[PDB]
UniProtKB/Swiss-Prot annotation, chain A:
Name this polypeptide is given: DNA-directed RNA polymerases I, II, and III subunit RPABC5
Comment field (misc): Present with 5300 molecules/cell in log phase SD medium.
Quaternary structure note: Component of the RNA polymerase I (Pol I), RNA polymerase II (Pol II) and RNA polymerase III (Pol III) complexes. Component of the RNA polymerase I (Pol I) complex consisting of 14 subunits: RPA135, RPA190, RPC40, RPA14, RPB5, RPO26, RPA43, RPB8, RPA12, RPB10, RPC19, RPC10, RPA49 and RPA34. The complex is composed of a horseshoe-shaped core containing ten subunits (RPA135, RPA190, RPB5, RPO26, RPB8, RPB10, RPC10, RPA12, RPC19 and RPC40) where RPA135 and RPA190 form the DNA-binding cleft.
HAMAP family: RNApol_arch_Rpo10 (MF_00250)
Function recorded in the entry: DNA-dependent RNA polymerases catalyze the transcription of DNA into RNA using the four ribonucleoside triphosphates as substrates. Common component of RNA polymerases I, II and III which synthesize ribosomal RNA precursors, mRNA precursors and many functional non-coding RNAs, and a small RNAs, such as 5S rRNA and tRNAs, respectively. Pol II is the central component of the basal RNA polymerase II transcription machinery. Pols are composed of mobile elements that move relative to each other. In Pol II, RBP10 is part of the core element with the central large cleft.
Coiled coil: none
Keyword Lipid metabolism: no
Subcellular location: Nucleus, Nucleolus
Swiss-Prot record, chain C:
Keyword Transcription on entry: yes
GO cellular component: nucleus; RNA polymerase II, core complex
SUPFAM superfamilies reported in the protein's UniProt record: RBP11-like subunits of RNA polymerase (SSF55257)
Any further remark recorded for this protein: Present with 4280 molecules/cell in log phase SD medium.
BP GO terms, sorted: RNA-templated transcription; termination of RNA polymerase II transcription; transcription by RNA polymerase II; transcription elongation by RNA polymerase II; transcription initiation at RNA polymerase II promoter
Gene3D superfamilies per the UniProt record, alphabetical: RNA polymerase, RBP11-like subunit (3.30.1360.10)
Origin organism lineage: Eukaryota, Fungi, Dikarya, Ascomycota, Saccharomycotina
Transcription in keyword set: yes
Name of the protein described by the UniProt record: DNA-directed RNA polymerase II subunit RPB11
Key words, A-Z: DNA-directed RNA polymerase, Nucleus, Transcription
SUBUNIT field: Component of the RNA polymerase II (Pol II) complex consisting of 12 subunits.
Swiss-Prot record, chain D:
GO biological process assignments: RNA-templated transcription; termination of RNA polymerase II transcription; transcription by RNA polymerase II; transcription elongation by RNA polymerase II; transcription initiation at RNA polymerase II promoter
Subunit structure, as described in the record: Component of the RNA polymerase II (Pol II) complex consisting of 12 subunits.
Taxonomic lineage: Eukaryota, Fungi, Dikarya, Ascomycota, Saccharomycotina
Residues the record lists as binding Zn(2+): C84, C86, C90, C93
Subcellular location, record wording: Nucleus
Annotated protein name in UniProt: DNA-directed RNA polymerase II subunit RPB3
Residue window of the full protein shown: 3 to 268 of 318
Function: DNA-dependent RNA polymerase catalyzes the transcription of DNA into RNA using the four ribonucleoside triphosphates as substrates. Component of RNA polymerase II which synthesizes mRNA precursors and many functional non-coding RNAs. Pol II is the central component of the basal RNA polymerase II transcription machinery. It is composed of mobile elements that move relative to each other. RPB3 is part of the core element with the central large cleft and the clamp element that moves to open and close the cleft. Seems to be involved in transcription termination.
Miscellaneous comment: Present with 10000 molecules/cell in log phase SD medium.
Keywords: Acetylation, DNA-directed RNA polymerase, Metal-binding, Nucleus, Transcription, Zinc
Coiled coil ranges: none
Curated annotation (Swiss-Prot), chain E:
Part of the full-length chain shown: 25 to 70 of 70
Species of the source: Saccharomyces cerevisiae (strain ATCC 204508 / S288c)
Record-stated family: Belongs to the archaeal Rpo12/eukaryotic RPC10 RNA polymerase subunit family.
Biological process according to GO: nucleolar large rRNA transcription by RNA polymerase I; ribosome biogenesis; RNA-templated transcription; termination of RNA polymerase I transcription; termination of RNA polymerase III transcription; transcription by RNA polymerase I; transcription by RNA polymerase II; transcription by RNA polymerase III
Misc. comment: Present with 907 molecules/cell in log phase SD medium.
Name of the protein in question: DNA-directed RNA polymerases I, II, and III subunit RPABC4
Modification after translation: The N-terminus is blocked.
Primary location: nucleus
Length: 65, 103, 114, 266, 46
């Protein structure tokens, strides 16, 4: 759906880092590997959080009601 | 909403949750064997035929939907939402034909 | 539904004490204590403090089931040494060791810039 | 100061990478556990959903809310609802947040912990402020609204332990290690050809002397010197996690010494 | 000023009694959602 707030495994607040990651990607034309390390997500447990995430909400906000 | 007259034939689940149109409106938490689609039938005054929530189940109403068929029959569709939290017993499989439960 | 309320882990429901003290029968000068709503956090601590104490002959603890929050603690102390006093003593021994750490830390924390 | 001795390597608002030294593994762990487990903290624990035409379901939303870390500096100055003599919640035991958001623009209205507003009197204690650690003041991304979708919520932050629900956890990861050079032989290193050549050396091999190949296994050498590193989630300043860790542990044993005392009398 | 039934597609807050069939204003969408409750659902944030 949307970013989990916290990395499941440990509980890093991860859900404050999704737009910024999407930026680190699009506007700063970075790759996810480098980008995720910049958001501070250093242990794969928290990386898999953002990197694995599927933002289906942006498809849900496409239907009318 | 049925409240017993001459047949009293109802179910143990509470009707305290159905609106006066006989339908839980969205939002309302439903559990036990709570009645969801409060329906009634005069047979040849009040023989309750109604869909109570499934015994083991308990949720919150997501969408009640009232329709018309081709024979024009009144349709009701109740979506009842439940969040399911991995407990002991729940079954999980990796992608290589080995499932296993939470111990 | 069967899931016991998570508070039951650190919170004593009724009739339960923190400590039940049982006089180990199998051996002399030994006691079994049941901590309710504790776990390894405390267990492994108290035990390895209890174990340093030299007039303690035996210290062990076990949580017999992961489901329940409680654990048993057995201390066998020398003749004329009360295990309750050994506990008290090993308990104090901890409180003092943590005071040190609390200090040492807040201390070494202040010297840090950031 | 005789006994357990901290030796901080980094310190930040987020981290405390330190080195406990002269302690039993027991204790070093016990604290490690307390931090992950039992440091009290404030966190949305009840949501009253007024309006939600958003795409997410209420309890979904509700869940995340609870996961948004809140200010817990002055959490001791708050009572657990359960002990507070009120009835449910009151300013003594509870902060009361609000989230009102309407998809106003035809663009996608994002919703954030920033949009959470304390609607109860805090009585001056730093508490319940949605922790915002991000570089654009938004904080956690609660929901996304399309134009015409509303979200009206009343949250209630109550005081809880991570043991009750890992949402009340002030720690994030807690790195923790001892014996970087496997000198207590506490592990038997798995290997295809070479124990040494296959396992990458730890962070903390630098902070410690590599054993001499000629030596006898030091049998008497117990485990002291534990290279920890507490990461904070934001609800409480790191330095304070480690403290309340050492603090709450202190309270525990204290809760027991009082029981061995009040075990007598009547 | 109160709503009993929303309608499926136009979202136009209807609200009709018996013998009204099952239609909406302009959008005779014979579907109609049942609109929420005001009885404020409370939630565990766990
Ligand atoms: Zn993680
Ligand atoms: Zn209160
Ligand atoms: Zn319509």
């Amino acid at each position: 759906m949307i970013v989990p707030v916290r990395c499941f495994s440990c509980g890093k607040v991860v859900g404050d880092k999704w737009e910024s990651y999407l930026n680190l990607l699009q506007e700063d034309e970075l790759d996810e590997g480098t980008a995720l390390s910049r958001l501070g997500l250093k242990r794969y447990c928290c990386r898999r959080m953002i990197l694995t995430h599927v933002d289906l909400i942006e498809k849900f906000l496409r239907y009318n009601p | 909403k049925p409240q017993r007259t001459n047949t009293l034939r109802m179910k143990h689940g509470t009707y305290d949750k159905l609106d006066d149109d006989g339908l839980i409106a969205p939002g309302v938490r439903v559990s036990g064997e709570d009645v969801i689609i409060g329906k009634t039938t005069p047979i040849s005054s009040k023989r309750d035929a109604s869909t109570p929530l499934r015994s083991t189940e308990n949720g919150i109403v997501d969408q009640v939907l009232v329709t018309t068929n081709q024979d024009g029959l009144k349709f009701v569709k109740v979506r009842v939402r439940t969040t399911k939290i991995p407990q002991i017993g729940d079954k999980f499989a990796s992608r290589h034909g080995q499932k296993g439960t939470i111990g | 539904m069967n899931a016991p309320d998570r508070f039951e882990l650190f919170l004593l429901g009724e009739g339960e004490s923190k400590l039940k003290i049982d006089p180990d029968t199998k051996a002399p000068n030994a006691v079994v204590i049941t901590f309710e709503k504790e776990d390894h956090t405390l267990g492994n601590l108290i035990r390895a403090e209890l174990l340093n104490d030299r007039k303690v002959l035996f210290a062990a603890y076990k949580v017999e089931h992961p489901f329940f929050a409680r654990f048993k603690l057995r201390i066998q102390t020398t003749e004329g040494y009360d295990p309750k006093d050994a506990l008290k003593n090993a308990c104090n021994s901890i409180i003092n060791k943590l005071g040190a750490l609390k200090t040492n830390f807040e201390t070494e924390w202040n010297l840090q810039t950031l | 100061e005789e006994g357990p001795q901290v030796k901080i390597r980094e310190a930040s608002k987020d981290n405390v990478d330190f080195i406990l030294s002269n302690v039993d593994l027991a204790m070093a762990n016990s604290l490690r556990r307390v931090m992950i487990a039992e440091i009290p903290t404030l966190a949305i624990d009840s949501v009253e959903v007024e309006t939600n035409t958003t795409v997410l379901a209420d309890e979904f939303i509700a869940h995340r809310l609870g996961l948004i870390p809140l200010q817990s500096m002055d959490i001791e100055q708050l009572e657990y609802s359960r002990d507070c003599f009120c009835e449910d919640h009151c300013d003594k035991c509870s902060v009361v947040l609000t989230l009102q958001a309407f998809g106003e623009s035809e663009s996608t209205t994002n919703v954030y912990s920033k949009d959470l507003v304390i609607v109860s009197n805090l009585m001056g204690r730093n508490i319940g402020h949605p922790i915002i650690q991000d570089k654009e003041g938004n904080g956690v991304l609660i929901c996304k609204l399309r134009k015409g979708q509303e979200l009206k919520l009343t949250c209630v932050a109550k005081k809880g332990i991570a043991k009750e629900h890992a949402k009340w956890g002030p720690a994030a990861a807690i790195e923790f290690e001892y014996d970087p050079w496997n000198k207590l032989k506490h592990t038997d290193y798995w290997y295809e050809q070479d124990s040494a050549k296959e396992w990458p050396q730890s962070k903390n091999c630098e902070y410690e002397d590599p054993p001499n190949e000629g030596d006898p296994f030091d049998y008497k050498a117990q485990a002291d010197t534990f290279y920890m590193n507490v990461e904070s989630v934001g609800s409480i300043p790191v330095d304070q996690v480690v403290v309340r860790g050492i603090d709450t542990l202190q309270k525990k044993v204290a809760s027991i010494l009082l029981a061995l005392t009040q075990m007598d009398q009547d | 000023a109160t709503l009993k039934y929303i309608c499926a597609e136009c979202s136009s807050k209807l609200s009709l009694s018996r013998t009204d069939a099952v239609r909406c204003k302009d959008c005779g969408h014979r579907i109609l959602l049942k609109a929420r409750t005001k009885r404020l659902v409370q939630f565990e944030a766990r």
